[PDB]
A paper describes a structure:
RuvB-Like (RuvBL) proteins are found in the domains Archaea and Eukarya, including humans and fungi, where they exert roles in transcription regulation, DNA damage repair, cell cycle control, stress adaptation and disease. The RuvB-Like family includes two homologous members, RuvBL1 and RuvBL2. As constituents of chromatin remodeling machines, RuvBL1 and RuvBL2 are involved in epigenetic regulation of transcription through the deposition of H2A.Z in nucleosomes flanking nucleosome-depleted regions around promoters (SWR1), by remodeling nucleosomes in order to increase DNA accessibility for the transcription and repair machinery, by enabling progression of stalled replication forks (INO80) and by the acetylation of histones H2A and H4, increasing chromatin accessibility (TIP60). The RuvBL1/2 complex functions as chaperone itself during the biogenesis of Telomerase, H/ACA RNPs and other supramolecular complexes.
The crystal structure of the full-length human transcription regulation factor RuvB-Like 2 (hsRuvBL2) in its apo form was determined to 2.89 Å resolution. The structure shows a hexameric arrangement of monomers similar to other structures in the RuvB-Like family. In the ring-shaped hsRuvBL2 hexamer, each protomer comprises the typical Rossman-like αβα fold (domain I) and the canonical all-α subdomain (domain III), which form the ATPase core together with the internal region of domain II. Moreover, there is an outward-facing mobile unit composing the external region of domain II, linked to the ATPase core by two β-sheet linkers. This unit is absent in all previous crystal structures of human RuvBL2 and is observed here for the first time. The interfaces between protomers form a complete nucleotide binding pocket, which includes the canonical nucleotide-binding motifs in domains I and III: Walker A (G77-T84), Walker B (D299-H302), sensor 1 (M326-N329), sensor 2 (T397-A402) and a trans-arginine finger (R353) from the adjacent protomer. Despite the fact that all purification steps were performed in the presence of ADP, no electron density corresponding to this nucleotide (or segments thereof), could be observed in the pocket. In addition to the overall mobility of domain II, there are four additional loops that are probably too mobile to produce an electron density: D148 - G159, D185 - V187, S203 - C227 and R253 - Q255. Thus, our apo hsRuvBL2 structure provides a missing link that supports the mechanism proposal whereby the N-terminal loop provides an interface between the external region of domain II and the ATPase core.
Numbering used by the authors:
A (entry chain A), B (entry chain A): 43 to 147, 160 to 184, 188 to 202, 228 to 252, 256 to 456
The structure:
């Protein structure tokens, strides 16, 4: 584990894809992550974005989320793609770094090569109040920590997605306003042009990110045509789809097809697969979520919760970590124990027990009926 | 029973959820109450709102109620969410409290520290007509019941839902007017802005309440996308859904799914379940509804009506309380008896007997046919 747990084979395949992307040998190609749910597909796609760069746009959606009352399928996909396409701007900031020589209430700084007196404002004096070398950024303040020049320059790369720029140009309770969440079509075409001229001027760079679409089988034929068209664009992001369906109907038609994907799009897919998490992987993941939530848990508790993860889902086992720690705090305990796990397991149902919620009452009802 | 009866396990689970809400560990999470109908699900959700505060907005809808001739699905949900989001305003009222020293027809009040003469209007004199210490609110009147100052200040917190404000800004027979029941989209965005500036000024506070959606399986995929988006908002209420369906189709698609809910939304659900009411719980509830309706009922009558509640539904047994008391009043009786229960049970059908209404006539018809 160097960022995530398990899924060694899938990660290995993902690595080969990353080398295709860097070598440019993935033009007009997308990825499909087959496998059952809860096998770390999102982690795979997310880690691929990071592998391309520290600030690579990553967007994760679900197939069902393009059918909404707030947007059209076209608008939903457009936003999904514009969140995954980054614009990289270089900010050039001036930074005065030097050794403090004197303060007068004028600031005299020096490097090993020069010395200068800088006028001091009221905000600077106070800021300064809160003979050793430091840093000062212009139109800003101090950062107490030099040779060469006193005023040097530091670069600050900024990465912003096309969608982020859409919002800046075009929010509180906006969801509950009743009006759609569309972006004006004439605003995007203004931003598409502003970003086009900046790129021609060399002031901006386009960084195609990673768009992850889970439950891709929920898309209909119209939406797949959109995706297929996007893979032919030169600025498109790395498309990654996922589904646990084998063969199924193509929504919008009466035709079966592998994963419910039309052939024109299947033809350009690199298919990978994830397997279910082993007993070791499951406990490893559980341990990592406990540290993140600052939850101390007994070893007998890890064993039980791990078993629950294998018998139900890793998503469900993680829910119980938050619940068990509260049950632990109520009894003034210091670490989650097996009893805490048993209680929350009885209080909160997993998807399988929830779909058969009476079977537990029928058993009890019959068990008492025999008395 | 400290507010409601039975459902100890479900209430226990609900309590653990309340601690998550208060600790903030429920971001992007909703609740699903599985179980059969008539098991106090609404009471659970309602009690959770009260547990958050005395004036926490609570809204209860049914899945089928978003499909109407008066609103669109978007409008129906928007109102449902805006009824569940509260705006808390602090009114600062001046209250003169002091000991009456003299009346002149001028009112002289005093505390243990000061004394003052207040001019008296005609309304005040009359109001006063209807040497001991009392209270007076300015621009109002008297409340006959002190040290410190004479004019003190009392705070009156006011809680109003976003929807209540929508109506104030935007009624008799409005339902039968033929025109839709929409709120102008430009009016909400004006109220969203007025509430936004008040909050920035510290004059208003947003109180996310509790939205309860029963029969959630009636929602279609478009509506579930809306809910999933709302759980990502920071001002959203605590969403609570319910259904007695196990696995069923996702309306708008041809795919089965647990409770007819898409996975993107299932993934973020804490599932609880309610069991059927026991014989003891059922009689307890019946006793409480009698006191509320001011109905005296014999113990042999409670036993019979309780049995009816177990064999049909608690909703139906409660209907018979109103009917039986009228049958009781007709015969000039003082308390409902078994006979009163037997009569109304024969006069008013439960859902099961109503769906087989001829079987009672066929039995009688055949019974006479044999004579
Ligand atoms: Mg594995
Ligand atoms: Mg369709
Ligand atoms: Mg599960
Ligand atoms: Mg019970
Ligand atoms: Mg429909
Ligand atoms: Mg009934």
């Amino acid at each position: 584990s160097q960022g995530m747990v398990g899924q060694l084979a899938a990660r290995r395949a993902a690595g080969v894809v990353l080398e295709m992307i860097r070598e440019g040998k993935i033009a007009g190609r997308a990825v499909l992550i087959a496998g059952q749910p809860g096998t770390g597909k999102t982690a795979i796609a997310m880690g691929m974005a990071q592998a391309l760069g520290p600030d690579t746009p990553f967007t994760a959606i679900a197939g069902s989320e393009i059918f909404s009352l707030e947007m059209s399928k076209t608008e939903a996909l457009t936003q999904a793609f514009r969140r995954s396409i980054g614009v990289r701007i270089k900010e050039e900031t001036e930074i005065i770094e030097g050794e403090v020589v004197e303060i007068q209430i004028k600031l005299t700084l020096k490097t090993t090569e020069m010395e200068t007196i800088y006028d001091l404002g009221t905000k600077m004096i106070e800021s300064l109040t809160k003979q050793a070398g430091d840093v000062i950024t212009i139109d800003k303040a101090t950062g107490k920590i030099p040779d060469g020049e006193l005023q040097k320059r530091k670069e600050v790369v900024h990465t912003v997605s096309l969608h982020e720029i859409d919002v800046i140009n075009s929010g509180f309770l906006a969801l509950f306003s009743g009006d759609t969440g569309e972006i004006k079509s004439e605003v995007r075409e203004q931003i598409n042009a502003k970003v086009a001229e900046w790129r021609e001027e060399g002031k901006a760079e386009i960084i195609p990110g990673v768009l992850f679409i889970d439950e891709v089988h929920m898309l209909d034929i119209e939406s797949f045509s959109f995706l297929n068209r996007a893979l032919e664009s030169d600025m498109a992001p790395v498309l990654i789809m996922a589904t646990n369906r084998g063969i199924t109907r193509i929504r919008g038609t009466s035709y079966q097809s592998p994963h419910g994907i039309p052939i024109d799009l299947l033809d350009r897919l690199l298919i990978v697969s994830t397997t279910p998490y082993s007993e070791k992987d499951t406990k490893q993941i559980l341990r990592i979520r406990c540290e993140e939530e600052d939850v101390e848990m007994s070893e007998d508790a890890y064993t039980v919760l791990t078993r629950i993860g294998l018998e139900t889902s890793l998503r469900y086992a993680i829910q119980l970590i938050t619940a068990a720690s509260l049950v632990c705090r109520k009894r003034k305990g210091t670490e989650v124990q097996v009893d805490d796990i048993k209680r929350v397991y009885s209080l909160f149902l997993d998807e399988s027990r929830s779909t058969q919620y009476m079977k537990e009452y029928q058993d009890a009802f019959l068990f008492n009926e025999l008395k």
